[PDB]
Structure formats: C-alpha cells, structure tokens
Design a protein around this ligand. Structure first.
Ligand SMILES: [Zn+2]
Lengths: 235, 7
C-alpha cells in the first residue's frame, strides 16, 4: 500500500499543444521571462504582462487543446490509490483537472485564476483581465494579477508538499527540466526520507543515483506504461 | 525551500 507523490512539469503537457512555460535561454518561447514572469516585469509594464497572460489563458481553452494519455494515466493512478496519492504540478494549465485528477497542488499557481494583488485571494477567472477588473475582497478594490507564481516569488502549498515528501514511498518526477527550484530539489528530499525515486521524461534532467529508476521518451508513451505497470503491481 | 528560481 505505498504512498505515491507525483511532481509534473511542462514536459507532460508539451504533447497537448500548450504554449510553454518551460524556461529556455531566459525565454518562454518568444517572451523574456524577465519581462512576463517576474514581479518587476509586471511592475514595469502591467499592460503588456496582462496581455501576455490574457493570450495564454485564451490559448489554453481552445478546442484543439486536450489532456493527453499521460494526463489520463495519472488520473487512473489517483483512482487506484486515493488518499495515498498526491499530485504536485509546476504547470499552470488545467489539463490534470480535465483528466480527472483532484486536489492538484499547483505550486506555481493557475492560469485560470487571478489574484487580488493586495489580499492575495485567488478566484476562478476564464476571460481577459482589463484595467477595470478589480477585486471584491477589499475595502478599496485593487487591481487583479494572474494567479501564476513568478520567478522570485514563493511557491504555493510548500508545507503540504514537504510533509507529503517526507512520507512518500514512491516519488515520480514527470516532464520536469531540473532547472526550476525548489521543485527540482524535491527528488533529493524524497531520497533523504527513503522513497523510491522515478524520472519519466523526454530527456534526462539530473545525472546520477538520485533517480533510482528512469525511463525516457515521449510523455504520452512512457507515462502510461509506467503507471499501468505500477497498477498491476498492486494486484 | 526558498523562492521560485532558475539554475
Ligand atoms: Zn482585494
């Protein structure tokens, strides 16, 4: 009856056609992370940053965008393990939710949520954000910002995550780059507490003994077959 | 674990 914690990154959603939040060369595809993924960027040019996330939010909800087999396999794994399963994602898309996962910890926030920039309260939000969209949680309504964690900000749900990490029998990292901390350090924390560690990725992130078990290839192929193997090892 | 950071 093992406890399983799964961490996912941008690699699992790549095959779904998602404009990516994988940082490469300081770029998020064609935008400077410094400009649209930092608190300073939002302070320097909020109208641009709101437009960048408005565009991402729209693209996320286009009909061609669907959870892929890897998303579905994790939903099956949660079905089989119940409270013994926790999914933590660095992704701000909702493809895990659409797949059927519940209680997903979005450590970097969610594209389909916005946040009151003073209260910090988040709320579901599917449309554009305009300068006249303001909070309802405060005495003087304040501007709303994307509920996406930027580089330089503290990730969400870390107490819950580290608790689960200390308890996990199996830790699986899927589609993560190994460049973004503290997420990339979770494997180390998992191994310090005796978990069996697994990497499922398109390319190797780390080099060494820190993932005990590793399989590489497209997420839609490698992930369902690891999960299906794991699910048959319970029976 | 600190803030969200690269490298
Ligand atoms: Zn407010």
């Amino acid at each position: 009856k093992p406890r399983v914690l799964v961490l996912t990154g941008a690699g699992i959603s790549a095959e779904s056609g998602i404009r990516t939040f994988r940082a490469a060369d300081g770029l998020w595809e064609e935008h400077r992370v410094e400009d649209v993924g930092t608190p300073e960027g939002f302070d320097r040019d909020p109208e641009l940053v709101q437009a960048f996330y408005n565009a991402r939010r729209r693209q996320l909800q286009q009909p061609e965008i669907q959870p892929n087999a890897a998303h579905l396999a994790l939903a099956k794994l949660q079905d089989a393990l119940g409270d013994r399963f926790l999914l933590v994602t660095q992704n701000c898309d909702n493809l895990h939710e659409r797949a059927g996962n519940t209680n997903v910890i979005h450590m970097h926030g969610e594209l389909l949520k916005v946040r009151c920039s003073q209260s910090g309260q988040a709320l579901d939000w599917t449309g554009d954000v305009t300068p006249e969209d303001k909070c309802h949680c405060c005495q003087f309504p304040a501007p709303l910002r994307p509920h996406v964690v930027w580089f330089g900000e503290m990730p969400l749900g870390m107490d819950e995550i580290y608790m689960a990490l200390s308890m996990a029998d199996i830790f699986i990292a899927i589609g993560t780059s190994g460049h973004v901390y503290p997420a990339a350090g979770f494997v180390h924390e998992a191994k310090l507490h005796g978990a069996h560690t697994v990497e499922l990725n398109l390319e190797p992130s780390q080099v060494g003994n820190e993932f005990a078990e590793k399989y590489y290839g497209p997420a839609s192929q490698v992930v369902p077959e690891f999960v299906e193997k794991l699910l048959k090892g319970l029976k | 674990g600190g803030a969200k950071r690269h490298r």
